[PDB]
Design a protein around this motif. Structure first.
Motif, PDB file in Angstrom:
ATOM      1  N   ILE A  56      42.816 111.729-107.988  1.00  0.00           N
ATOM      2  CA  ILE A  56      44.054 111.209-108.037  1.00  0.00           C
ATOM      3  C   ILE A  56      44.937 112.066-108.994  1.00  0.00           C
ATOM      4  N   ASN A  57      44.527 112.599-109.853  1.00  0.00           N
ATOM      5  CA  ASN A  57      44.915 113.806-110.748  1.00  0.00           C
ATOM      6  C   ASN A  57      45.606 115.012-109.895  1.00  0.00           C
ATOM      7  N   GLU A  58      45.085 115.439-108.991  1.00  0.00           N
ATOM      8  CA  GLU A  58      45.125 116.476-108.131  1.00  0.00           C
ATOM      9  C   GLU A  58      46.419 116.043-107.315  1.00  0.00           C
ATOM     10  N   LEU A  59      46.360 114.833-106.779  1.00  0.00           N
ATOM     11  CA  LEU A  59      47.410 114.218-105.831  1.00  0.00           C
ATOM     12  C   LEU A  59      48.907 114.314-106.943  1.00  0.00           C
ATOM     13  N   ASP A  60      48.644 113.845-108.129  1.00  0.00           N
ATOM     14  CA  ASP A  60      49.744 113.833-109.292  1.00  0.00           C
ATOM     15  C   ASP A  60      50.365 115.034-109.196  1.00  0.00           C
ATOM     16  N   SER A  61      49.454 116.209-109.390  1.00  0.00           N
ATOM     17  CA  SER A  61      49.863 117.460-109.545  1.00  0.00           C
ATOM     18  C   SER A  61      50.675 117.885-108.108  1.00  0.00           C
ATOM     19  N   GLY A  62      50.157 117.577-107.071  1.00  0.00           N
ATOM     20  CA  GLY A  62      50.475 117.966-105.876  1.00  0.00           C
ATOM     21  C   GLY A  62      51.965 117.391-105.359  1.00  0.00           C
ATOM     22  N   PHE A  63      52.409 116.250-105.934  1.00  0.00           N
ATOM     23  CA  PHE A  63      53.618 115.935-105.626  1.00  0.00           C
ATOM     24  C   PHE A  63      54.373 116.487-106.641  1.00  0.00           C
ATOM     25  N   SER A  79      63.109 106.662-100.189  1.00  0.00           N
ATOM     26  CA  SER A  79      62.408 105.688-100.934  1.00  0.00           C
ATOM     27  C   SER A  79      61.209 106.209-101.243  1.00  0.00           C
ATOM     28  N   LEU A  80      60.683 107.117-100.675  1.00  0.00           N
ATOM     29  CA  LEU A  80      59.373 107.981-100.835  1.00  0.00           C
ATOM     30  C   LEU A  80      59.316 108.270-102.286  1.00  0.00           C
ATOM     31  N   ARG A  81      60.463 108.595-103.004  1.00  0.00           N
ATOM     32  CA  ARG A  81      60.502 108.722-104.436  1.00  0.00           C
ATOM     33  C   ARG A  81      60.125 107.425-105.359  1.00  0.00           C
ATOM     34  N   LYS A  82      60.694 106.459-104.533  1.00  0.00           N
ATOM     35  CA  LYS A  82      60.218 105.090-105.198  1.00  0.00           C
ATOM     36  C   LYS A  82      58.608 104.797-105.206  1.00  0.00           C
ATOM     37  N   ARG A  83      57.970 105.442-104.232  1.00  0.00           N
ATOM     38  CA  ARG A  83      56.590 105.017-103.709  1.00  0.00           C
ATOM     39  C   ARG A  83      55.807 105.822-104.857  1.00  0.00           C
ATOM     40  N   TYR A  84      56.483 107.065-104.902  1.00  0.00           N
ATOM     41  CA  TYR A  84      55.611 108.162-105.785  1.00  0.00           C
ATOM     42  C   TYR A  84      55.619 107.522-107.238  1.00  0.00           C
ATOM     43  N   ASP A  85      56.846 106.804-107.710  1.00  0.00           N
ATOM     44  CA  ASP A  85      56.887 106.648-109.073  1.00  0.00           C
ATOM     45  C   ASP A  85      55.788 105.505-109.618  1.00  0.00           C
ATOM     46  N   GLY A  86      55.167 104.862-108.388  1.00  0.00           N
ATOM     47  CA  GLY A  86      54.090 104.072-108.418  1.00  0.00           C
ATOM     48  C   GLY A  86      52.834 104.781-108.691  1.00  0.00           C
ATOM     49  N   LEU A  87      52.605 106.016-108.461  1.00  0.00           N
ATOM     50  CA  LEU A  87      51.461 106.843-108.413  1.00  0.00           C
ATOM     51  C   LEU A  87      51.021 107.177-110.020  1.00  0.00           C
ATOM     52  N   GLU A 110      56.906 122.425-114.077  1.00  0.00           N
ATOM     53  CA  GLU A 110      56.020 123.232-114.065  1.00  0.00           C
ATOM     54  C   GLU A 110      55.322 123.077-115.454  1.00  0.00           C
ATOM     55  N   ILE A 111      56.260 123.304-116.489  1.00  0.00           N
ATOM     56  CA  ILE A 111      55.574 123.040-117.784  1.00  0.00           C
ATOM     57  C   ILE A 111      54.757 121.821-117.788  1.00  0.00           C
ATOM     58  N   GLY A 164      51.619 107.664 -96.617  1.00  0.00           N
ATOM     59  CA  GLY A 164      50.224 107.123 -96.347  1.00  0.00           C
ATOM     60  C   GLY A 164      49.221 107.631 -97.627  1.00  0.00           C
ATOM     61  N   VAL A 165      49.475 108.924 -98.079  1.00  0.00           N
ATOM     62  CA  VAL A 165      48.557 109.206 -99.088  1.00  0.00           C
ATOM     63  C   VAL A 165      48.880 108.279-100.413  1.00  0.00           C
ATOM     64  N   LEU A 166      50.127 108.192-100.713  1.00  0.00           N
ATOM     65  CA  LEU A 166      50.459 107.362-101.810  1.00  0.00           C
ATOM     66  C   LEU A 166      49.682 105.891-101.806  1.00  0.00           C
ATOM     67  N   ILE A 167      49.781 105.348-100.539  1.00  0.00           N
ATOM     68  CA  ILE A 167      49.117 104.159-100.236  1.00  0.00           C
ATOM     69  C   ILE A 167      47.473 104.209-100.471  1.00  0.00           C
ATOM     70  N   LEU A 168      47.004 105.582-100.141  1.00  0.00           N
ATOM     71  CA  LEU A 168      45.694 105.791-100.263  1.00  0.00           C
ATOM     72  C   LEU A 168      45.400 105.738-101.894  1.00  0.00           C
ATOM     73  N   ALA A 169      46.211 106.387-102.658  1.00  0.00           N
ATOM     74  CA  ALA A 169      45.983 106.260-104.243  1.00  0.00           C
ATOM     75  C   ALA A 169      45.651 104.929-104.785  1.00  0.00           C
ATOM     76  N   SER A 170      46.584 104.168-104.394  1.00  0.00           N
ATOM     77  CA  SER A 170      46.437 102.689-104.688  1.00  0.00           C
ATOM     78  C   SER A 170      45.228 102.032-104.351  1.00  0.00           C
TER      79      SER A 170
END
Lengths: 217, 217, 217, 217
Positions: free
Chosen positions: D174-181, D190-198, C37-38, D143-149
């Motif tokens: 993209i930044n709103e998506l970043d905040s969403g995740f 491995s979704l966590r893995k895909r996320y790390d690529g955002l 959150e921070i 699917g949303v993570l693939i969208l970002a790429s």
């Protein structure tokens, strides 16, 4: 035949097999050396005002492809045709480099993408339907990716050389390549990895196009 | 001899071998510290307007190499000059760093590539002909590759410092290095690995020239 | 004692250990949520195309750090202070992020590097050596390295936001962090690896300064 | 029952289970082809100059989705509408891609993030509260993570396509998506893995805006 005889014969085939790898290794080293010399004849296009040094450089590069042809001929006289993919990894690297160089010489002269079979003719290798040494599809595509990287670099140097047209041609060409690589299902770990680096090349070329547009192209 | 007597004997030998490694390790540690100190003295060239500090920093660096010679002299004291390559791996790193630092000081002053032999003199080492702690071709080339990376960074800071001429010399220099490496058939995997990073330095500096050029500089 | 008597006893000890770890895990999960959150709260700085929101964002982050202190007070309740390192691995990750976040807040407010003791004060935790829950030197430096990366990112966005002065300050800052880390003779492999990333941040911020500079300002 | 009878019976269940996989994979094959055909239409709009083509391609992409709805209907035919997660692994990839292409169409039409339910309707499948064949949160997020790429790339092409507004909007998205995740714990897969690529795409997109604002953005 007895157990002892059978294994002695196996000892024979394995020894021959290993001798084949040796002959292959010698031919490949010679091939890598020739490929390095050709790159040197072409690398020069990156320096100096204008591009008058093309086709002189392309001519010299093509002449040198003569040595590639005979060595590939010699390389074929080293293993059973159907053993291609058994030893293929010995020349994977130099074959991809040769594809890149062939494509670079063809793009410099015509600004088009050399065909997979046209590369075959330049290398004196055999077409995908003429029994013999062939040009694998993943090796072709790898060569094209190396081309892209070379071209991104060329567009930057082109502006330095006073050519503000070439970069716009390269840009269009690299976007197309990127378009194609996406319409393909690459399942070769190596290719995916390489293709992943195309983004940097496409990014470099957009910056140039942008710099040019802003100043009126 | 009994297996027990044979092994008691091998114990003394291994124990002797390990005392040597320990000794070498302590000298190398001091060496790595002096090296970090020399680097600290030189990288100051990356900040501030202009480059008036170059002579002064090069003078302080070279004076600090005096300490380097001292430690390498002591390091030679810690092992049989005959087993150089048996213990080489212990100082491979700092040796490559020292080559870089010497090359960096020579380039800052003369804009030329220090000779392997000249580096040998700056370090108080012996040339291939004087039997006594040699400077490998492999280590020399690694240091040179590290030099190219430092120079591509310097090129960028030179523009920020208001010097639009250095970038052009650096780009030419790095391209001569690229051309030179292209004449080689690198076998060492570490070196061949580091060598693949050169093209990135070539492109970086060529991009600086581009930026300068497209703005009439 | 019989084998069964010994193991029934060890079962008790192991069971109590598992319960401690489970209680730690629950507080850590809470801590990680607050940290997230921070971060969200501070990353708004990358879009604030004006940066006049800095104080507001920092104060809100500090408000949230009040929640972090309570959770850490609770964490201190779940295990014997005597064995902080037996369980440190459970909160190592969030402790490092919290160092980063606290340092990011202080840099935003004062453009200085937060003291390890000052971070300790912000977390409601205890000083160095002894006295309770501590902040390791390695967790502190890992946090600082994470900050360097965030700052290189901030430099880019600061330009987009119209602020061309901040990139210059950030570059100076990260360069001092680079000099600082040089003085250390890093032994920890994790920290050593993370430190390699610092070099990339130094060059990235130096290129931003370069871009501004060649372009005028 | 005898051991033999137990296994003869088991042989049948396994063979039937295998026939289902063979049928599933057949449908998943055509699905992946249609998916490719759609990507061709969408990615084939990245540039040009910014045209009314966007709506044209989105509609053709939607016609193609008519084919996707049919094949999925056919897919629901190949297995018990109760063993979804049992066979889920077979179309996991293609579904995630379909989610991406769907989100891509919606983003191109309205610059909004398509809701999971709206994807369900485009694919002709049922809500995660209906019955047979759903789109779980897991595959939606992928699917949303693939969208970002794709967005990072869309952004680069827009600039090479004279359009200079697009990048600004993409960056914010993209930044709103970043905040969403960031609100998510993602304590799974491995979704966590895909996320790390955002984060990479986030920086890549911010860099594009940086390049544009290097003037007056």
């Amino acid at each position: 035949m007895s157990v002892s005889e059978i294994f002695v014969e196996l000892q024979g085939f394995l020894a021959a097999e290993q001798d084949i790898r040796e002959e292959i290794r010698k031919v490949v080293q010679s091939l890598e050396q020739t490929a390095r010399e050709i790159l040197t004849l072409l690398q020069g296009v990156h320096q100096g005002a204008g591009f008058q040094d093309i086709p002189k450089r392309c001519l010299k590069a093509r002449e040198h492809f003569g040595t590639v042809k005979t060595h590939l001929t010699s390389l074929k006289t080293k293993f059973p045709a159907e053993q291609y993919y058994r030893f293929h990894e010995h020349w994977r690297f130099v074959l991809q480099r040769l594809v890149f160089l062939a494509a670079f010489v063809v793009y410099l002269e015509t600004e088009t993408l050399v065909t997979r079979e046209a590369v075959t003719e330049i290398l004196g290798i055999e077409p995908d339907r003429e029994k013999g040494f062939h040009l694998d599809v993943e090796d072709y595509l790898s060569g094209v990716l190396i081309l892209a990287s070379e071209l991104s670099r060329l567009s930057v140097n082109s502006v330095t050389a006073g050519d503000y047209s070439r970069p716009l041609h390269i840009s269009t060409f690299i976007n197309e390549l990127d378009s194609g690589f996406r319409l393909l299902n690459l399942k070769n770990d190596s290719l995916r990895k390489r293709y992943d680096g195309l983004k940097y090349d496409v990014k470099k070329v957009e910056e140039v196009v942008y710099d040019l547009s802003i100043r009126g192209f």
